[PDB]
Design a binder for this molecule. Structure first.
Ligand SMILES: *[C@@H]1O[C@H](CO)[C@@H](O)[C@H](O)[C@H]1NC(C)=O
Ligand SMILES: *[C@@H]1O[C@H](CO)[C@@H](O)[C@H](O)[C@H]1NC(C)=O
Lengths: 126, 199, 295
């Protein structure tokens, strides 16, 4: 376990402390519907999943209006999501991960689910 | 006729500017003769151009502008002259980190026979480095180069407090500091701007 | 373009506050429809889409909660049925004024849980409180038996060890007159470790070395530390915030810069869980016992 672990955990901890409005939207609950899958797939799927989100909502006025603070608070969200994507992705080392598109649940929920899992890994490794 | 001498080298400040340096065979006008092309080894990411700057009559340097970088990032480097591809390589920032030298080093005189030196962490609180920076203060005497001292700081507060008892009154002292992050196996930063004071 | 609503939505509670919704498929819906149900709390607050005809959650029952359930043929932004059936569950009979306040808990040293509270604004001077707790591991709801009284506080404590997790907490009366009080404890949070033990203090050229043994039940990697250093002569109370305390089993090391062996330094060390392994990091352990160096 290298620094990537810490960077991920750090970003999640930053994402989960600041509740946005774009966080209401949903994504695939790869976690709650967990299978015989291995770690690599998981981080990967998360990367794939997270990609979809900002890949769509980076240009989404619905999340962007209100105040110029929230405008940036959204910028942050997209920024941190992007950073989270690349890390998980590289941590997986897989060319593609076919996401089955099964259940949906809020991104907030998703981020919390993941936050927990990463935390576990960080403490059990050596 | 163009030919690179020593293979380009890059360090990252893990914030934005990951500078790169190299030397050609003869004196080149870096700013007009060559171009530096970097790109993120990730899907959907385009290439980037850079106008190199002169670093010694033959030596060139470009500062790779990078919005935000993570541990996983792998970069493509290509050095162009015009249309003749001279050399190309890859570079993973997180691997080779040169922390941004700290600044605003100031000396203070508290009572109780203690000397307080305070500097500021060059990084913002959301930088992946902010929390791993361990500084190394360096206090020395002007005409006594043997009268040098180096104090390690591991705690988060960017402040060291030595005792006056370790300082000769009526004598000039200088202090400079440098930070580094052990978790990233970085190299030392530059020293901070020196400071002078007498007892 | 719109499927029919769900049928006979009911709601029951299991454990202490695991609210479980249940329903049936619509009537005479599209045959060419792959059947998915959409649900969220009042104010479309925390949404979710799944094939299951049920959705359960672990939520305190101090306030009332409603789930709205709808119908769908895809997982996307479809013509959503636009007919949301819904059912609520209301808090237990007792009046709000009688329920206890300030119900709090702390998982001490990953060994036991200590919870306390104060009586409600309008509580009979005779009411007896009982505290109940439940989590995945337990056979059935457990009753907390080691009670205590401190100042005006009432409280109980129970053994809770280690090998997502959260404990369900409820405190009510033995006469069923007052309003029950609920509490879900994150359990990756609210952890106060025991204080560390300073092994030794070595001076080496004015560089002070501090070795201490962290509390038995914790990993160094998961703790953050704060080192206090008081000086009798210079009267200089200092305290250092340290996150990485590594040496060159169980022990951790930190070095105090710029101190001299010709002055007494008193050292203490307290510890807290970090956000890298834990949900929150607010609850500092107590201070360790002191160890001084040499005047
Ligand atoms: C001290 O220097 C830093 C750059 O290292 C700068 O960002 C900061 O504004 C300076 N201090 C203040 C608060 O004036
Ligand atoms: C840190 O990097 C240097 C690069 O020269 C290497 O020699 C050293 O082994 C590294 N330290 C470790 C063991 O992480």
């Amino acid at each position: 376990c290298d620094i990537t672990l810490q960077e991920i955990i750090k970003t999640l901890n930053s994402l989960t402390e600041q509740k946005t409005l774009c966080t209401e939207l949903t994504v695939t609950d790869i976690f709650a519907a967990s299978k015989n899958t291995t770690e690599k797939e998981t981080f990967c799927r998360a990367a794939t999943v997270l990609r979809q989100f900002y890949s769509h909502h980076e240009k989404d006025t619905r999340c962007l209006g209100a105040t110029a603070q929230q405008f940036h608070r959204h910028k942050q969200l997209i920024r941190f999501l992007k950073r989270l994507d690349r890390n998980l992705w590289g941590l997986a080392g897989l060319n593609s991960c076919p996401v089955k598109e099964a259940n949906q649940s809020t991104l907030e929920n998703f981020l919390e689910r993941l936050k927990t899992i990463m935390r576990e890994k960080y403490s059990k490794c050596s | 006729p163009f030919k690179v001498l020593q293979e380009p080298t890059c360090v990252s400040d893990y914030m934005s500017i990951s500078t790169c340096e190299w030397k050609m065979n003869g004196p080149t006008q870096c700013s007009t003769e060559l171009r530096l092309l970097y790109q993120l080894v990730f899907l959907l990411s385009e290439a980037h151009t850079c106008i190199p700057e002169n670093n010694g009559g033959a030596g060139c340097v470009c500062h790779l502008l990078m919005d935000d970088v993570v541990s996983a990032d792998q970069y493509t480097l290509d050095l162009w002259a015009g249309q003749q591809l001279l050399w190309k390589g890859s570079f993973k920032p997180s691997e080779h980190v040169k922390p941004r030298a700290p600044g605003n080093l100031t000396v203070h005189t508290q009572v109780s026979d203690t000397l307080l030196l305070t500097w500021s962490n060059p990084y913002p609180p959301d930088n992946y480095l902010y929390n791993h920076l361990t500084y190394a203060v360096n206090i020395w005497s002007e005409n006594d180069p043997a009268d040098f001292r180096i104090y390690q700081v591991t705690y988060l507060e960017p402040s060291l407090r030595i005792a006056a008892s370790t300082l000769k009154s009526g004598i000039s002292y200088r202090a400079r500091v440098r930070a580094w992050a052990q978790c990233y196996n970085t190299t030392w930063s530059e020293w901070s701007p020196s400071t002078k004071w007498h007892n | 373009e719109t499927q029919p609503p769900v049928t006979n939505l009911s709601v029951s509670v299991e454990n202490l506050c695991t609210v479980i919704w249940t329903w049936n498929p619509p009537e005479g819906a599209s045959s060419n429809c792959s059947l998915w149900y959409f649900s969220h709390f009042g104010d479309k607050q925390d949404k979710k889409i799944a094939p299951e005809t049920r959705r359960s959650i672990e939520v305190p029952l101090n306030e009332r909660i409603c789930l709205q359930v709808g119908s769908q043929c895809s997982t996307n932004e479809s013509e959503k049925p636009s007919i949301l059936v819904e059912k609520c569950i209301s808090p237990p009979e007792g009046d709000p004024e009688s329920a206890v306040t300030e119900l709090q808990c702390i998982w001490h040293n990953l060994s036991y849980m200590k919870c306390s509270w104060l009586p409600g604004r309008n509580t009979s001077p005779d009411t007896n409180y009982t505290l109940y707790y439940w989590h995945r591991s337990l056979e059935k709801i457990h009753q907390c038996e080691n009670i205590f009284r401190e100042g005006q506080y009432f409280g109980c404590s129970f053994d809770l060890t280690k090998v997502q997790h959260s404990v369900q907490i409820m405190v009510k009366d033995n006469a069923g007159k007052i309003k029950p009080s609920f509490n879900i404890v994150p359990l990756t949070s609210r952890v106060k470790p025991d204080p560390p033990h300073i092994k030794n203090l070595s001076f080496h050229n004015d560089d002070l070395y501090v070795q201490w043994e962290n509390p038995q039940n914790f990993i160094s990697r998961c703790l953050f530390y704060e080192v206090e250093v008081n000086n009798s002569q210079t009267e200089t109370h200092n305290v250092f915030y340290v996150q990485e305390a590594k040496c060159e089993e169980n022990t951790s090391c930190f070095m105090v810069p710029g101190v001299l062996p010709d002055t007494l330094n008193t050292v203490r060390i307290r510890v807290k869980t970090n956000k890298l392994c834990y949900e929150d990091d607010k609850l500092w352990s107590n201070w360790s016992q002191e160890m001084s160096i040499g005047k």
